[PDB]
Amino acid sequence: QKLVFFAEXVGSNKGAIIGLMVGGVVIA
Amino acid sequence: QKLVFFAEXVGSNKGAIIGLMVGGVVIA
Amino acid sequence: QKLVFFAEXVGSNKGAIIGLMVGGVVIA
Amino acid sequence: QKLVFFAEXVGSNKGAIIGLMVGGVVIA
Amino acid sequence: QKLVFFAEXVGSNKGAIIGLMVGGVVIA
Amino acid sequence: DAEFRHXSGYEVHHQKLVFFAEXVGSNKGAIIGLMVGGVVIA
Amino acid sequence: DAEFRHXSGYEVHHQKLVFFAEXVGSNKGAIIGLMVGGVVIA
Amino acid sequence: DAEFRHXSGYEVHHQKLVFFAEXVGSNKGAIIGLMVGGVVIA
Amino acid sequence: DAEFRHXSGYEVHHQKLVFFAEXVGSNKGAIIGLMVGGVVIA
Amino acid sequence: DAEFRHXSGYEVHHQKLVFFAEXVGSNKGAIIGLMVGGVVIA
Amino acid sequence: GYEVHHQKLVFFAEXVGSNKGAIIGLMVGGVVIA
Amino acid sequence: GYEVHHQKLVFFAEXVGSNKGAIIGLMVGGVVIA
Amino acid sequence: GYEVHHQKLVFFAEXVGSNKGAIIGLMVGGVVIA
Amino acid sequence: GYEVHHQKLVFFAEXVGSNKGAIIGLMVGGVVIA
């Protein structure tokens, strides 16, 4: 699994980025 | 699984980006 | 599975982007 | 699993970035 | 698992970055 | 697995309420004698 | 696993309330004689 | 595992409340004779 | 494991309250005769 | 393991409160005759 | 000429509330992207 | 000419409330990206 | 000409409340990115 | 010509409240990145 986040400017993350989710609880 | 997020300007994430979801609960 | 999200300007994510959904609950 | 976060400008993280989630609880 | 955080400018982290999450509770 | 659950139990009895209105003009909000729980958006 | 839970038990009884409104003009908010819990946005 | 929980037990009884409003003009906020818990955003 | 919990037990009884409003003009905040717990944002 | 917990037990009884309002114009904050606990942001 | 005397915008979301869009009480100019 | 006498924007989210967008009580100019 | 007499922006989040976006009581100019 | 007489921005978060974005009571100029 290859994930790319290129943002020429204002690159921000406020949610949930998950390569693989097998279980558990994620709240963003 | 190759995922590309290119944003020339204002690139933001506030939801849920999941490459593979096998279980669990994800709330954005 | 190749996913491309190119946005020349204002690229934002607020929903759910899932390459493969096998189970669980995803609430955007 | 290769994850890239390149941001030419203002690159910030305020949410949840998880390579692999098997269990537990994550709140951003 | 290779995770890259390159930011040519202001690179900051205020959320939760987890290589592998098997258990426990994380609040960002 | 997430589990969301809520709600309330009300037990109201054996009460005497005298409601008298001799001069409420052009009311546009809320006029409540007695409010046990619930949501009021005036 | 996340578990969210709330809510309240109300037991109100044996009360005497006299409500008298002889001059409430152009009311635009909330006028509550008695409020036991709940949410009020006037 | 996270566990969020709240809520409040109310037991209000045996009270006498005389409410008299003879001059409340152009009210735009909250007028509460008595508030036991809850939220008021006037 | 995280565990968040709160809430308050209210037991209010045996009181006499006389509320008299003969001159409250253009109120935009909160006018509370008595407040036991809770949140008030005037 | 983290454990967060709070809340307060209120037991208010046997009081006499005379609230008299004759000259409160253009109020924009809080006018509370008696406050037991809670949060007031005037 | 514009005049707003009273305006209320109440958002009561008892559950999994959210707002992914703009909530503008009075829009006159500029650009709002949400 | 603009005049706003009273304005309220109440956001009561008793659960998992959130705001991923803009909440502007009065917008006149500029750019707001949320 | 702009004149705001009363304005309230109340945010009551009794749970896992959050704000990932802008909350602007009066926007006149500039750029707000959230 | 801008004049604000009263303004309130109340934030009551009785839980896991947080703010990842801007909370501006009056924005006139400049750039705010959050």
Added chain:
Amino acid sequence: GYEVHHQKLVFFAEXVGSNKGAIIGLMVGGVVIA
């Protein structure tokens, strides 16, 4: 010509309250990165 008579920015977080972003009572110029 800008004039603010009364302003309040109250942040009541009875729990795990936090602020990862900017809280500006009056923004006129400069750059704020949060």
